[PDB]
């Protein structure tokens, strides 16, 4: 609905198209400049009224370019009350996209608002402003004589049709030239995170053949595209010169004899490059209406998308399919994690206990049931506030760009005291020392220039942040050393007399005693949940 | 360098001699213009008339061929210097993503796309009109000495006018571009860890940091069209007036005793040519601009261009990190024999990871050599190396694509050499419960699978080819006892085949199969000897 609405609050449209219109009275100036003056030079008055005429003329001309700078400026205001208002919607709106939809995400959406912004302070964009007042210059040329302008309807029944035609083939190449395009430059860019291994195994060159399933069928369409578009471009800017040639070969056929004045054999000649004017500019760069309607639709469907914590955790009939899954995940889940209370999660890898993980959160949405958090039905707190009241240390750790305060306080405002304490309590304090400049290190997009394991540490200090009512540890063993694992049990411990509930995706035993109670999953079913000392027996 | 390849065509002669003619057949317009006066004065006989124009109609048939072959050239001239560069980009994009992480992007890509585009583009036929404008320049003042004065005149304003765009546009274009690139690059690494920023509601938070790019590119953006605009509406308006006060001297020069009747239009009309080609450039320097930015980057880009016996020795080697100015790795000297395992142990963060992206060598060292089997600084072509190799790195980088493929490096898909990998890995139980197991559309990076399954795949494709080389950074770090048990029953099986493995871990049961240990400590090798000695030590 909206993907038409935030251009269609800008109502200047009307006060542009009004404006339009006294621009193309006075582009009548160098036609009119034309007849004046040899309605000048029979008479012969060369001293005082061809100079008035010409100042005149050079006044005009200056009133002329006025009305017509001003309406550049008033576009570009335009793509920037666009900008400024769909800005944050597009980046918002693809993090909570790129979940539901993972398989396709990327910053697109900004190449083509940006490709939209380029378009409304286009030169192509004015051209077509233009057209809509033509039927004026379409009666000037008419008025003098009938003659005239049987060549402006069939000259432009012959232009109009070429750059009808310049459309129908080309239109179903560029579409999906400019797509491909894109699917190119994504499958590199997920291959470029990977480059490591492809070095490692010299795999460039097997790589390059799966890129070319798509490249190699973007540039046969682009080919086709600009060769075809050239091709008629080149048709509609050389016809402007010929059908002005033909008016002067009407306009001598027919001045010959007095019906026409002797000034008015090339003034008709003149109006008719104007009344093909704008037709043979916009093929000419009918790829930046091509692109720029290509990034349109594209931009345009991504924005179809548009109490306190104590610490009780319920799941009832819970039935989970992962974001592009088809398959169910997550199979009847029921339980039921108490306040304050600590569970470990434990099982082969097939179980699903990052997906159990990952819908206790809310990433994922339950198809079937409701993920309650303190009785009430989640769904129903906000993203950005509940935020602030939970921790989170996934699998793949996912560090941001930045530095190391910033990412422990969710780049949020750099509390000093709360970093501190944050890094004291996940122990990351004692690594984050040892960087090249501590705490204000740069961390790399990732956290590429980072050890995993100290990555990992500085991802539980992020989870610890403001002292959080859930805690859920996916796995934060994996890479850890002993001193980074003593950390994290020491966190565990100060956590579990906070009276904290923490969930822990963990197998390692020396952290399995304080657990209170295990969860065991098998085939993406809560096989078993009870007290620790009691599913430990049942385990041997 | 990348001149080299575009000075490798000698076709911009053809372009040259092309181009002249379409000079000497725009002159037409205003020649086809004088022969009608010429019409009146005897008041030629109409059929004549037509004539003429038969001749002219006949004549731009062939404008429009002379003009529209070099669309038909200029295209083709874009395709074979695609084809010359497409796969090099390609595949240096993965080296220089190793060495440039920062700007490591699809970007090089898009930056070939804005070549080939223009050298399609009309702007691009403007700019080839420029060396011979002198031609309408001569028929304009041949015919008439104070008309030559006005070209001159005129001529040095729009210049004035289009230099006047350059040097107050050539820095923000280059900003502008340059940061909505580094917006987009932020942006996509940014949202590879979406799954955080909805768990903790952080998206906000990003974004307020998000906009030290992108606020500084709309600011970039704005003010160089708005200045480019304002001098390009002063070309534009120029062109017309300066077409007008041509008529405006047109004029007086009749009226004076001069042979300027009826050609009054024809210095106007050959005006607009010697003022056509900049009118039509700075409307439109935008794509000059940014095809300049386009060129360089790309040119800066592409300015970075017997079989192993598992013998592996680093001698003096000291290692730097890409875009890290203190060393990793310290001297570090160690010979790993054929067939000989060693275990790579130390605290988290003391240089292993690194050792290994070395003896691959994915990293090269600042000093010290590196050398395999026998003294070879990389001299190896890593597609041939590659398959002699085996790697399962600390992130496990699995890709886009079927289990098969993945297992087979992207490999021809060999039925056969898929499953003994795996049954080796031990991976072949895992990757049947899939549904259609080995042919499985695993997901950019293995999203479509648990980080857990990966390893066991990503093993899969360490082993496949029977490597002489195996380096494991790391890979039990997610594995189930079932997985873990069958790395550690891999291990034993290429221990039985000689391979020289180096694993990085810590585990209790692999130091007792390992051979050799090496102990890293602050990026230099505290230890390296036999595991017997070292694990009792350790205590
Ligand atoms: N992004 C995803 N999209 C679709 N299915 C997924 C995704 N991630 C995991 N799965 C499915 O869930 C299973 C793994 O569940 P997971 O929660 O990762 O268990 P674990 O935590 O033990 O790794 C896999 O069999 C896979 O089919
Ligand atoms: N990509 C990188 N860029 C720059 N420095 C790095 C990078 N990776 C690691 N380092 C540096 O090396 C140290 C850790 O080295 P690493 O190879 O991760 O050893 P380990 O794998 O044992 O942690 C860190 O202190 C960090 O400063
Ligand atoms: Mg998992
Ligand atoms: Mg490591």
């Keep these: ?58 006044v005009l001309y200056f009133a002329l370019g ?6 550049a400026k008033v576009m570009q205001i335009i793509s920037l009350k666009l900008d400024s208002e769909l800005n944050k919607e597009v980046f918002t709106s693809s993090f ?12 697109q959406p900004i190449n083509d608002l940006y490709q939209l912004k380029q378009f409304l302070t286009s030169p192509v964009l004015f051209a077509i402003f233009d057209l809509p007042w033509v039927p004026i210059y379409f009666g000037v040329l008419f008025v003098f004589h009938v003659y005239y302008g049987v060549m402006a309807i069939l000259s432009m029944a012959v232009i109009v049709a070429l750059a009808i035609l310049n459309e129908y083939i080309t239109k179903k190449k560029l579409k999906e030239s400019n797509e491909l395009l894109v699917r190119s430059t ?21 790589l390059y053949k799966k890129w070319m399933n798509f490249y190699s069928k973007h540039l046969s369409a682009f080919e086709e595209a600009t060769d075809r578009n050239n091709f008629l471009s080149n048709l509609t800017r050389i016809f402007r010169i010929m059908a002005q040639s033909l008016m002067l070969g009407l306009g001598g056929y027919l001045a010959i004899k007095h019906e026409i004045t002797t000034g008015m054999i090339v003034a008709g000649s003149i109006l008719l490059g104007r009344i093909l004017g704008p037709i043979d500019t ?16 594209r931009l345009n469907e991504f924005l179809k998308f548009l109490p306190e914590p104590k610490g009780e955790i319920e799941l009832s009939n819970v039935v989970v399919v992962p974001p592009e899954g088809k398959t169910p995940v997550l199979r009847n889940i029921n339980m039921r994690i108490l306040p304050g209370e600590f569970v470990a999660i434990i099982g082969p890898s097939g179980s699903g206990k990052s997906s159990l993980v990952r819908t206790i959160l809310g990433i994922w949405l339950p198809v079937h049931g409701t993920v309650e958090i303190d009785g009430a039905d989640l769904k129903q707190w906000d993203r950005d506030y509940f935020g602030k009241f939970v921790g989170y240390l996934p699998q793949d750790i996912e560090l941001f760009e930045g530095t190391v305060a910033e990412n422990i306080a969710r780049f949020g405002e750099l509390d000093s005291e709360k970093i501190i304490e944050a890094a004291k309590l996940s122990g990351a304090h004692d690594v984050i020392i040892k960087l090249p400049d501590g705490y204000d290190t ?3 997009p990732g956290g590429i220039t980072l050890s995993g394991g100290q990555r990992q540490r500085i991802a539980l200090a992020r989870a610890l942040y403001g002292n959080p009512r859930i805690v859920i540890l996916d796995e934060p063993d994996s890479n850890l050393d002993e001193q980074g694992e003593q950390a994290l049990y020491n966190a565990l411990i100060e956590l579990k007399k906070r009276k904290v509930t923490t969930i822990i995706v963990s197998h390692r035993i020396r952290l399995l005693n304080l657990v209170d109670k295990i969860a065991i999953m098998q085939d993406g079913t809560l096989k078993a949940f ?5 599913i430990i027996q049942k385990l041997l």
């Design 282 to 297: 916009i093929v000419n760069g009918w790829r930046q209406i091509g692109n720029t309607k290509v990034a349109y639709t």
């Design 186 to 206: 994504n499958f590199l860019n997920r291959a470029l995170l990977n480059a490591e291994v492809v070095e490692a195994l010299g795999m460039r060159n097997n």
């Design 1 to 58: 609905v909206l993907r038409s609405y935030l251009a269609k609050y800008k109502k200047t449209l009307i006060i542009v198209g009004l404006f339009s219109l006294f621009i193309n009275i006075l582009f009548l100036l160098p036609s009119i400049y034309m007849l004046a003056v040899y309605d000048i030079v029979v008479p012969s008055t060369s001293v005082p009224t061809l100079l008035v005429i010409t100042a005149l003329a050079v």
């Design 66 to 71: 006025l009305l017509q700078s001003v309406r």
């Design 530 to 534: 009870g007290k620790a000392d009691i």
């Design 96 to 107: 909570e996209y790129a979940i539901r939809n993972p398989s396709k995400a990327s910053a």
């Design 442 to 444: 740069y961390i790399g």
